[PDB]
Design a protein around this ligand. Structure first.
Ligand SMILES: [Ca+2]
Ligand SMILES: [Ca+2]
Lengths: 511, 511
């Protein structure tokens, strides 16, 4: 067959991939979202499903105070001698001292005998000089950590628990700001160093070097940049941060991150993971997509195609929270449940609105399309001012768009946008009592909400004609590194009473 | 379970129903659409599927010159002694003479041993004094035809081939304009006459009478009207034109026609078929829904629920045209094919645009939602000015909204509305060559079109913020008796060349 990029749509930055046997595994940055480090599985490199996460509170890292687009980012997954290694960076809210150590970020090492975990408790490697750690072992079994700026090589104990001395930069890069995303690869004696250069913005690219020996000297590639988007009209932009993988059939493919401009320079869905083949030259270099840049349509890998259960309808009947959901920061396990009313996902109304960092139990899944629908059946009965629950299209504390059943001098269905820190009520209609149907209709940059009492007749509650603020660039946040999510929420305002909001099902329709 | 009205959504006026054993069959008017008289099947009175039609050109009636909302309307289906009888009215374009007979409409009688046909060739009964013919047999096996005004009883030969004399009005009605849709029913000695009164507009209602003897006198019902919509804010309006049916379990239900106002007094989808129970009183009358009017949510019939293959995706792989499609008037079998490229529905570009009555091979299915998506993959290569093919949201020759790939100084994707006879180009964008993806996005009264080259990245071609003209009332046609359809088309303009437009699939998504 053929496939269309990106293969893993939705909020999926900083891809990293390994092949073990017939299986392929991917990790993506998650920032303030919990659980941390989303782990995905594929058999054909085209169709991916989420299979778990790296840090799941059993190994207790806490994000309840982490700022937007801070926290766990840029993971690398690797496999050596029956152990899966995930190295990642925890970006701090700001300068923080840990052992006479002015640090703004820390490296994390978790490991497990299985790709989906449970991984070990995060071991910190407090080397705050760079970002995008990647794991590399050499033919002699010595473990190394690559960090930015460019390729700085860190030896590791066996162990991978701490640096065993001497940092050294094996490749400086070409030029261009933010030489990062370092990756090494040993192929036929040579050591291939991979970089991301130009910044994660629209000048993003992939540049590589090569050396006979691990510690250099490395010569630049004559095809640099081996991957970039030079066509500003192409629907896929900001291509970079790649990693190579070789299939069981001898093919070579590269996953990388990319953005889909949504009617302008707005990556509403966030950075996604794209796919493209790797072709080897006769002078010992590799190139992505024959230097043609990101492909829109592409010959699919020579692997048996395996498509997954999308799980776009969640009836909340299984005892386990489905792996496509994410919590904004750590859950409040006292105020959410799938067991207090089986068949329903119960959210007790928290004490904080979505614009606060302390809001809890916002449950959201990724938007994978610019044209989609999101629906919910809700059993909710707000009794006092401020008590509310419903659907939200969420980017960050300063940028969301919510629709909720609320008590505000009687039952009301209310549409509220938070646009770059500015709250505005887009609509408010009288609400009758009883189970309620809410539908979020997303049409490119136009997004509206509809309420219903039987799922058959819909009424417009309110909407916006400009949802550009639900994007990386439109959010105007100091760091727009995530992506817009759609999901459910509940808070009291307001009146610190625990009112139960029972969501019978969630429904996602790409139309 | 429960169900929500209308049960048979989309263009389905003048319902008529019979039970035979465990099966239930419905017929609806089709006007200028071919084939004529859409026959539907249900096992639970809630879920219906189209199983065929009454007049399929093998019994040759021709609609190529019939005007909008003229032609075959108001069918009645009945079952006596192993024969299914469909009586219907053919409304003519205007006064026409047939045997020294100034007639504007004619009654039609077809019959078959099977509900889906093939039925006999239409036998005309040229009694142009009324509308809405219904078939009634008495305990003595004598066949009768009921016609408007009100209940006028016509005896029939055995035979049902012609009136056997003496017309007589058994019930005059109550009052209110257009007393029509006559129906008789014999239940415990009594003869129950059913009427539709108030006009098919918003004063529509169901009124009944009763007599000890077939020819009267009939006494009015003290609960009249037994069914109407008096709440102008209810999402279901214009309720009337009903018929009764009794289940195998002894329950009684009534199907009737109704409209769904779509943000105002606009029945965009056309009149549909609704369902509601019938309750019997102790003074020998029956009432629909306990005189509570059309129900939004209702207890479902005491029948095993059987839901059908929706067939919302048509890959055009089967050799037979799916029964959910309709032709605007008679097909041009020389210029359409499922066999000239199997897997594709081929439409050769006709010589006439959709605004002409002579346009042929417009293939459309019913809109069943105010929020839906309609997509098409198209292989088309227009070479000269005017050659075009794509998606159309179609109501009538004066009211449609089309989106097509067209040659107009190069390949262009064009959006054109016909609004009450006024053509306007809503958008025009340069088109690249090759297979094309078109998507019609319908959001209440806002409707837009998107084109794509790989199905992954969509671009806005054009749209309207006011599609009220795609309705019965908004169309401003002298008769708005149908409903908006979505489908495919192709014409040369234009340059009378047969350019092949190959539609690989059609996709309907209620979001
Ligand atoms: Ca459930
Ligand atoms: Ca096909």
């Amino acid at each position: 067959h053929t496939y269309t990029n990106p293969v893993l749509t939705g909020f999926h930055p900083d891809p990293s991939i390994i092949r073990v046997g017939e299986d392929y595994y991917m990790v993506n940055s998650t920032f303030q979202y919990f659980p941390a480090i989303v782990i995905s599985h594929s058999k054909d490199l085209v169709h991916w499903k989420i299979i778990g996460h790296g840090i799941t509170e059993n190994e207790g890292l806490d994000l309840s105070d982490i700022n937007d687009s801070h926290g766990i980012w840029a993971p690398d997954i690797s496999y050596h001698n029956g152990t899966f290694y995930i190295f990642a960076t925890h970006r701090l809210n700001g300068p923080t001292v840990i052992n006479g150590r002015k640090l703004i970020r820390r490296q994390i090492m978790i490991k497990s005998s299985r790709p989906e975990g449970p991984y070990s408790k995060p071991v910190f490697i407090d080397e705050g000089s760079g970002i995008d750690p990647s794991h590399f072992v050499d033919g002699d079994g010595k473990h190394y950590m690559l960090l930015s700026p460019a390729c700085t090589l860190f030896p590791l104990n066996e162990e991978c628990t701490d640096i065993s001395g001497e940092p050294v930069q094996i490749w400086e890069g070409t030029g261009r700001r933010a030489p990062e995303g370092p990756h090494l690869l040993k192929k036929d004696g040579y050591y291939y160093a991979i970089l991301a250069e130009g910044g994660t913005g629209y000048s993003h690219s992939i540049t590589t070097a090569r050396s006979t020996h691990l510690y250099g000297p490395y010569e630049p590639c004559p095809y640099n940049p081996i991957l970039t988007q030079t066509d500003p009209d192409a629907p896929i932009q900001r291509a970079g941060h790649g990693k190579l993988v070789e299939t069981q059939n001898g093919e070579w493919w590269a996953v990388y991150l990319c953005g889909r401009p949504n009617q302008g320079s707005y990556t509403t869905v966030g950075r996604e993971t794209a796919l493209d083949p790797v072709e080897w030259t006769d002078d010992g270099w590799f190139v992505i997509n024959n230097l043609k840049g990101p492909s829109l349509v592409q010959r699919a890998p020579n692997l048996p195609q395996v498509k997954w259960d999308e799980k776009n309808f969640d009836d909340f009947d299984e005892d386990t929270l489905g792996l496509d959901w994410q919590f904004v920061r750590n859950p409040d396990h006292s105020s959410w449940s799938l067991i207090e009313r089986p068949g329903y996902l119960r959210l007790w109304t928290g004490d904080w609105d979505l614009h606060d960092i302390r809001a809890k139990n916002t449950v959201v899944r990724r938007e994978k399309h610019h044209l989609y629908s999101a629906g919910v059946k809700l059993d909710f009965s707000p009794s006092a001012s401020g008590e509310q629950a419903g659907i939200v299209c969420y980017y960050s504390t300063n940028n969301y768009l919510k629709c909720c059943l609320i008590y505000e001098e009687g039952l009301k269905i209310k549409v509220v946008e938070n646009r770059s820190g500015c709250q505005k009520t887009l609509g408010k209609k009288h609400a009758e009592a009883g189970p309620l149907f809410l539908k979020a209709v997303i049409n490119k940059q136009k997004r509206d909400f509809y309420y219903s009492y039987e799922g058959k007749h819909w009424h417009h509650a309110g909407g916006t004609e400009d949802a550009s603020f639900l994007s990386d660039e439109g959010s105007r946040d100091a760091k727009g590194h995530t992506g817009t999510m759609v999901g459910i929420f509940a808070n009291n305002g307001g009146s610190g009473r625990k009112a139960a909001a029972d969501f019978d099902w969630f429904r996602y329709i790409a139309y």
